Design a binder for this molecule. Structure first.
Ligand SMILES: O=c1ccn([C@H]2C[C@H](O)[C@@H](COP(=O)(O)O)O2)c(=O)[nH]1
Ligand SMILES: [Mn+2]
Ligand SMILES: [Mn+2]
Ligand SMILES: [Mn+2]
Lengths: 138, 141
């Protein structure tokens, strides 16, 4: 069963712009393009969250159906974020698994006042350099 | 499984299912089905999305500066950017998970529309992504 990362690979092949299979340093125009796509998708999510917060400040009780535009824009952001990893030739699932393992290890840490999970004493970061080296050879 | 099961090798978890595991582990809200959020949850999700976006941008800028000055970039030089892009995935999935919205279901519908459009400009009979229908269907699962 395909992953969302593999879906992006299929999409790029379908638009005739097949992407490398292994990590590949990109030309500058590729980085600038991916940055623009990330910024526009981030701005759409940001605007929608501000929009929902303003409705709540007005006293409206949101329903689940009110969440459809935000869910759509969040998925569009996933699309362009996976898309950036795919055009770099970087297996997003392998990097994500490393990041996830180093996030589960934060469970014993304290929380910030806004709810952000913080790092416990002694915590050590994900080793994404090692994942990249793993993907680069085989 | 039952006494007849002689092997059990499940499909690996999706990245969306990983966010559910993380939020369970840290005691954060992770509803099974779509759930309107308190404003405090929306504010946190915004903060994490802004923070992760800023970190990605910082790493893209570092790469552009190094290659501008002639540096030969190896695959290993992409590791900070890849880490920050994975963090951005993480908090984007994380917002969908805290809303009780199956990110894989929503992504699959966005992908269906995007992949369909690539076979056309739109092909005949093209249907845009119907995320509203996905959330309704998730409510009745
Ligand atoms: O409340 C939290 C705190 C951290 N993270 C994940 C997202 C990133 O992968 C990474 C960011 O953590 P910091 O490095 O900013 O502390 O942890 C969350 O998803 N929710
Ligand atoms: Mn969009
Ligand atoms: Mn980060
Ligand atoms: Mn951070």
């Amino acid at each position: 069963p395909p992953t969302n990362a593999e879906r992006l690979h299929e999409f790029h092949r379908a638009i005739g712009a097949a992407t490398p299979e292994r990590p590949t340093p990109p030309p500058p125009e590729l980085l600038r393009l991916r940055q623009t796509l990330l910024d526009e998708a981030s701005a759409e999510v940001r605007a929608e969250i501000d929009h929902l917060l303003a409705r709540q400040a007005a006293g409206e009780a949101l329903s689940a159906g009110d969440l459809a535009p935000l869910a759509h824009e969040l998925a569009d952001l996933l699309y362009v974020t996976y898309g950036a990893l795919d055009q770099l030739g970087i297996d997003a699932d392998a990097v994500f698994a490393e990041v996830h393992r180093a996030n589960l290890s934060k469970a014993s840490g304290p929380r910030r006042a806004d709810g952000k999970q913080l790092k416990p004493e002694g915590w050590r970061p994900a080793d994404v350099r090692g994942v990249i080296e793993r993907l680069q050879h085989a």
